Design an enzyme around this catalytic site. Structure first.
Site, PDB file in Angstrom:
ATOM      1  CB  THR C  56      -1.045  -0.040   1.139  1.00  0.00           C
ATOM      2  OG1 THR C  56      -2.085  -0.956   0.777  1.00  0.00           O
ATOM      3  CG2 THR C  56      -1.641   1.346   1.425  1.00  0.00           C
ATOM      4  CB  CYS C  72       7.249  -3.602   8.658  1.00  0.00           C
ATOM      5  SG  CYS C  72       8.193  -4.765   7.665  1.00  0.00           S
ATOM      6  CB  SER C  80      22.270   1.464  28.031  1.00  0.00           C
ATOM      7  OG  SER C  80      22.124   1.822  26.673  1.00  0.00           O
ATOM      8  CG  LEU C  81      18.463   4.549  31.603  1.00  0.00           C
ATOM      9  CD1 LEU C  81      18.582   5.683  32.625  1.00  0.00           C
ATOM     10  CD2 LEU C  81      17.058   3.906  31.622  1.00  0.00           C
ATOM     11  NE  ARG C 109      21.244  -3.953  33.481  1.00  0.00           N
ATOM     12  CZ  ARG C 109      22.411  -3.359  33.694  1.00  0.00           C
ATOM     13  NH1 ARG C 109      22.823  -3.139  34.939  1.00  0.00           N
ATOM     14  NH2 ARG C 109      23.163  -2.977  32.661  1.00  0.00           N
ATOM     15  NE  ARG C 116      25.980  -1.172  33.944  1.00  0.00           N
ATOM     16  CZ  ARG C 116      26.398  -2.201  34.677  1.00  0.00           C
ATOM     17  NH1 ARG C 116      26.755  -2.030  35.940  1.00  0.00           N
ATOM     18  NH2 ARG C 116      26.453  -3.411  34.152  1.00  0.00           N
ATOM     19  CG  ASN C 284       8.033  -8.551  10.424  1.00  0.00           C
ATOM     20  OD1 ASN C 284       8.342  -9.744  10.485  1.00  0.00           O
ATOM     21  ND2 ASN C 284       7.054  -8.113   9.670  1.00  0.00           N
ATOM     22  CB  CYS C 286       3.390  -9.829   9.994  1.00  0.00           C
ATOM     23  SG  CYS C 286       2.514  -8.286   9.980  1.00  0.00           S
ATOM     24  CD  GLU C 288       6.415 -10.366   7.008  1.00  0.00           C
ATOM     25  OE1 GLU C 288       6.149 -10.402   8.229  1.00  0.00           O
ATOM     26  OE2 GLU C 288       6.150  -9.362   6.321  1.00  0.00           O
ATOM     27  CB  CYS C 309      11.699  -5.960   4.905  1.00  0.00           C
ATOM     28  SG  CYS C 309      12.786  -6.834   3.609  1.00  0.00           S
ATOM     29  CB  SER C 472      -1.310  -6.930  -1.788  1.00  0.00           C
ATOM     30  OG  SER C 472      -0.751  -6.334  -0.617  1.00  0.00           O
ATOM     31  CE1 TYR C 577       1.334 -11.709  13.355  1.00  0.00           C
ATOM     32  CE2 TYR C 577       0.119 -12.277  11.354  1.00  0.00           C
ATOM     33  CZ  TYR C 577       0.457 -11.368  12.327  1.00  0.00           C
ATOM     34  OH  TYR C 577      -0.077 -10.111  12.260  1.00  0.00           O
ATOM     35  CE1 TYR C 578      -2.630 -11.580  14.239  1.00  0.00           C
ATOM     36  CE2 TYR C 578      -3.421 -12.318  11.990  1.00  0.00           C
ATOM     37  CZ  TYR C 578      -3.109 -11.235  12.973  1.00  0.00           C
ATOM     38  OH  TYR C 578      -3.291  -9.940  12.627  1.00  0.00           O
TER      39      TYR C 578
END
Lengths: 734, 16, 584, 16, 152
Positions: C56, C72, C80-81, C109, C116, C284, C286, C288, C309, C472, C577-578
């Site tokens: 799309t 995506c 670390s912060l 952690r 730390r 990612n 989904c 894949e 991707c 699609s 996945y789902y």
């Protein structure tokens, strides 16, 4: 490639061709089943290293999952695959060992009783083995096998191993039951009985089929205990319940004699507080050996309609009261006679009494109706006696509304149980029933668990498979076989309570009934609902009672009448054909086809081995084994479903293929009338009672609500046709 | 379940 | 959502063929005039006749004044912060462009870990997880509507019991992070513990030097360090029964459908990347996409790596034979490669990943229809060989296209970090158990290709990834990705009425289709996924399905939930996945 | 949804 | 919360007058030797006799190896994702040192405001406010217990 873990631990390449051959074997003779369909479904689940038993469960379940009305032969495909599997599990191969080698091994492992090897020689086991047809295993349906595997076949609870197969079960039950027969007749009886059970003509209860041949002597599946109005009897009763529920027996408790709330201080023995606290005590007793405190252990408790506390008792399993006003995990039987019904019809009152305030009323209720009426009306006068008045319409409605809402408030017509009965009501009244409302036998209160003067009734059950018999004259041999098998078991088994042994040795009471009635009607082109079966039912149940009586008669000649035969109406030459509810004449005109007068004399002269012979019980397990419709009941549908840890178990009604239209499914019945007339016609001949159901589909009634008018009219129709008891009320969900 | 409507007139005819 | 239009006034300014011609025109606009309009014509043909599908953002955007097309992204968070902040900032930037997010947060952690100094990691993972969630939802109207992320962590993380139940309905509000999905990362040893009925030891990644790295890169090393650290009683640890741990995960997966699984060994033993240089350590939204990442220490940190991707799909229903895939592969790979230079990068780390590895994720749509018209089904193994044949052809030709393009324009900068550079092919490293479920021969010259790749390299470090498609595939009237249709007619609500779409060629194929719920179980499907995974560079959005009414008392047995999980693993399935549970 | 009944015996056979 | 001690073992290592003398000593440690110990004495006197009070971070920390003593910060957010991110990052950094936060967020443009190209301010203030809140709570055990902010 694809590898397979062998039985040992060894691994070898998969033999897809072997799997195909077992499937082809299993499918032989069957119709509308696809072998390749089963392969597709199961093979896709195979994985490299899969063990051999798991390949087996996979093909079994695959075949099982295709069971349907359109392809009902998947029941048999799955069955045979399961059988084959179970052979391998037990014997390491498909061919069973020789009978003798098998029994010897099982005695070694302590899984069979060694008396079998004591009572029979190797020659005799060799001979019995020639009776055995292991191919009869091929005739079970899949749900049948799941029941064999679940609760019949000798096995290890812990490890999961199965040690026997169905034909050894069958031959050895015969062998055990007939083991005291003279050698002249012994192996004849064994063969004939083995034939009868292995070809499904006779069914036996689960305790018998799982236990007879093993080291146990506990086979008693339902007991009947009467409670007297004293703490000693209350305690005794409770103790006897505990003892019996620990052996997984169903309980019928008569507790109608316990005096009502507010009754005078008897000194010490505290009956001021009434029935319910004692009822709760019997309930914990009944549940004393149940994991949850609900799961397992079952009882039906009995009391008279006119008990002072009745309004409180009727609502004991109603959902929301205070916790001390409910006793929810027991069912109840409300006891009614003609006068009570008359009050209803005449729109009059019913007077409620505590049994402790009305000398002789309780006894009369069961034994003598004219006397009951006299004492009842007398006591309604007398204002010195504590009493309470209710409108009969109000009282009956309360009962009928509780019956409907729970399905589990039951009815016993106590006059019918004594005016039409194998027992003299003045010596041995029937004053209660059992869990399932088909057993009608004399009881006496205990004053202590071991009181030699109490009487507990047990019943000893079997059934004829009306679908497995080509004609009614087969019932002669089958009656001989069934009556003798059960009579032997009475001596064979043990009694945890002296009172139970007294009842059994004294009256030697049997309860033989039927399964597959619906199928039988269907194949004769009759139905339940329209009266079209009335005459056939008369014909059928005459033949059953005649031949049962004939068998028990011959056995009395051979071995002696039961000790207390003199307490039966049979002793006085009175037959069931003499005492039945006359209104039955208006709904069937089938003539008697057998010589009842010849029999009458023979009974007066020689007596009966057994005080009762017949009782129409429900069957769930017995009838799944035979692929039979349950007891006398119409099938709820063409395919039944059970959950199990192994998947959905489906069973198609017998010969669905040719009889789908001939069946009348439970909910197709416009109402209960036809069924109840059949029950009445049955009750003409049956010694005890019948587990009679009433059914209501709300969607047949305006605004989906069942009218009380109709609930009561079926109740009265039952009574008019001399129906002794009513069991479950089924209300359709939907 | 139930409709607690009951007529005595109708019942009273019945022969037990 | 495709045609150029006015959001406000409601006017539409173009039609579909201008969309199509101009996407071609834009993507090939730097081609030499000798070849340019040839490529434009051929690509226009491929898309306008539905042989190739594009995402799309591309179809709505390419030709307009924008340069944001990234749908995506994959961001890895360090312990670390600074990296937590960077991660958050990068999420905000990307969700504002409506990109889906995969967040690796498994390195943070655990609750109760040593001070730390300043950087306060005492309080643990969840407060940070909530922060990524608000970041993900930072550009969503409700605070729920829009913006989507999947967050990844290892099964053995000390906090795992708390993490597994993050989207469970009723806990205290501070114990839940409900509007993000999760991927639980598992390897062989974890599964072995389950089968052997043993324990799993839970560690905070900060207390076990090298364990985290090994989990993805080197299984023998992982096992050594793992068993070593289970000894050492100086190390903070916690023990759980594997059956208990897996059940907790599987019960949360089932109840929400949205707790996912990544087999991290499979993602690295069977991969276009050398796990010692460029490990795949997450996926990612989904599940894949499988690509290398590096933590950022600041939004603009030049040394971080974010994976994006770049997607497309072949329409297996629109092609008469598999040899059409050669041209279509040339077209798809070149179109996507051009877009990488064409588009903009809001974050230096994202540009690094894209320019360095030039990674593509081309998949398929209309698989179900394709099976149906070849008279195969999902559930019975009848499609195994055709699938092998089909996906060999896809990977071969994709690799061939990317190869030619490397000859013409140069291998991608970081080609040397691929297993392809060392002459290793997907046909060399796949899960061997696959041999037992298909015997289709390779039909293409993989050895010719092997040499050509070693010599000339690939333009793209990855080529293939099997994604879901909703939009699609509706355009092509195609069945979604590799999925069986739930039914013959699908329904969508819209402000214009009920939108119905009938599955392609229902007229002639109604019986040939196997609807999702007609499948007796997941086995056949999962084998197809495994056969697919043999050739695919990245991963597959693999679903598991359960119809309660197929099970005694309408309840799905954990026994079966676990057996499908293990079947996935055995056939080398990288991700799941789902989980669809049928309503009814 | 779920039945949390799990047998280890059955699982332990599986080859990863 | 003042005396230097071990969180783990429960041991206390100092008493109040060392706390006080050493806070003075540290704060005046760059003073010229002529005035230094005068200032130290006078300040020690002022605090030890309760005339001057100091915040908890100072009294617990000054003399220890730390240099984090900042107990409240004030950050202003601009109308851009970059500033929103910066703001958030600065909150995280400061709440990890247990500082209270004042956030000015009044400049963030309202729900429904024109597409600035990319930088998505269509959706408004609240989703960003939630983001500052998780930032503020980023170092709190419950996700409530500790970490505090007022937004303007």
């Amino acid at each position: 490639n694809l590898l397979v873990t062998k039985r040992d631990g060894s691994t070898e390449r998969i033999n897809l061709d072997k799997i195909h051959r077992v499937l082809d074997w299993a499918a032989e003779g069957l119709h509308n089943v696809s072998i390749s369909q089963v392969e597709l479904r199961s093979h896709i689940q195979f994985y490299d290293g899969i063990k051999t038993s798991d390949i087996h469960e996979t093909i079994i379940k695959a075949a099982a999952d295709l069971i349907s009305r359109d392809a009902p032969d998947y029941q048999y495909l799955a069955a045979r695959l399961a059988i084959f599997h179970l052979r391998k599990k037990a014997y390491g191969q498909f061919e069973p060992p020789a009978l003798y080698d098998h029994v010897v091994k099982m005695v070694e492992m302590g899984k069979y009783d060694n008396h079998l090897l004591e009572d029979y020689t190797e020659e005799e086991f060799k001979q019995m083995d020639t009776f055995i047809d292991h191919d009869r295993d091929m005739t079970f349906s899949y749900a049948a096998v799941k029941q064999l595997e679940g609760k019949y076949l000798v096995q290890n609870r812990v490890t999961g191993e199965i040690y026997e197969s169905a034909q050894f079960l069958y031959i050895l039950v015969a062998a055990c039951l007939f083991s005291n027969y003279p050698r002249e007749t012994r192996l004849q009886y064994v063969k004939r009985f083995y034939d009868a059970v292995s070809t499904f003509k006779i069914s036996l209860p689960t305790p018998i089929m799982s236990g007879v041949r093993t080291p146990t002597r506990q086979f008693s599946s339902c007991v009947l205990i009467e409670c007297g109005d004293s703490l000693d009897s209350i305690n005794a009763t409770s103790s006897a319940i505990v003892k019996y529920v620990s052996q997984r027996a169903g309980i019928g408790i008569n507790a109608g004699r316990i005096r009502a709330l507010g009754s005078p201080i008897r000194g010490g023995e505290a009956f001021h507080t009434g029935c319910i606290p004692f009822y709760k005590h019997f309930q914990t007793a009944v549940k004393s050996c149940s994991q949850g405190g609900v799961r397992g252990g079952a009882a039906t408790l009995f009391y008279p309609m006119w008990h002072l506390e009745v309004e409180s008792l009727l609502v004991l399993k109603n959902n929301r009261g205070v916790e001390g006003n409910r006793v929810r995990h027991m069912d109840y039987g409300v006891q009614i006679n003609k006068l009570m019904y008359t009050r209803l019809l005449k729109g009059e009152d019913i007077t409620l009494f505590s049994p402790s305030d009305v000398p002789g009323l309780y006894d009369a209720f069961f034994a003598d109706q004219e006397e009951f009426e006299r004492l009842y009306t007398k006591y309604e006068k007398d204002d010195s006696i504590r009493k309470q008045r209710v409108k009969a319409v109000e009282l009956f409605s309360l009962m009928m509304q509780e019956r409907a809402s729970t399905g589990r408030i039951y009815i016993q017509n106590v006059d019918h149980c004594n005016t039409h009965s194998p027992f003299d009501p003045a010596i041995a009244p029937v004053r209660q029933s059992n869990l399932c409302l088909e057993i009608a036998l004399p009881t006496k209160p205990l004053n202590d668990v071991n009181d030699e003067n109490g009487e507990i009734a047990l019943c000893t059950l079997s059934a004829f498979n009306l679908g497995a018999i080509n004609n009614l004259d087969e019932l002669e041999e089958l009656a001989i076989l069934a009556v003798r098998a059960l009579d032997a078991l009475l001596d064979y088994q043990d009694y945890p309570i002296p009172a139970a042994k007294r009842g059994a040795m004294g009256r030697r009471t049997l309860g033989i009934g039927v399964i597959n009635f619906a199928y039988y009607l269907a194949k004769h082109g009759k139905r339940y609902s329209d009266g079209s079966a009335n005459n056939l039912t008369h014909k059928t149940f005459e033949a059953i009672q005649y031949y049962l009586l004939k068998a028990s008669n011959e056995l009395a000649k051979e071995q002696g009448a039961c000790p207390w035969f003199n307490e039966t109406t049979y002793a006085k030459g009175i037959l069931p054909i003499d005492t039945y509810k006359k209104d039955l004449d208006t709904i069937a005109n089938e003539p008697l086809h057998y010589d009842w007068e010849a029999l009458r004399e023979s009974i007066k002269t020689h007596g009966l081995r057994n005080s009762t012979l017949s009782a129409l019980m429900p069957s769930e397990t017995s009838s799944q084994i035979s692929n039979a419709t349950n007891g006398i009941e119409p099938p709820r549908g063409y395919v039944s479903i059970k959950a199990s840890k192994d998947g959905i178990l489906r069973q198609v009604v017998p010969d669905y293929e040719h009889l789908h239209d001939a069946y009348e499914l439970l909910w197709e019945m416009p109402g209960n009338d036809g069924y109840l007339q059949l029950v009445g016609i049955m009750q003409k001949f049956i010694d005890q009672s019948i587990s009679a159901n009433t059914n209501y589909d709300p969607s047949r009634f305006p605004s989906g609500k069942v009218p009380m008018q109709q609930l009561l009219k079926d109740l009265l129709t039952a009574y008019k046709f001399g129906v002794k008891t009513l069991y479950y009320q089924n209300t359709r969900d939907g | 379940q139930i409709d607690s409507e009951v007529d005595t007139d109708d019942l009273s005819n019945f022969q037990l």
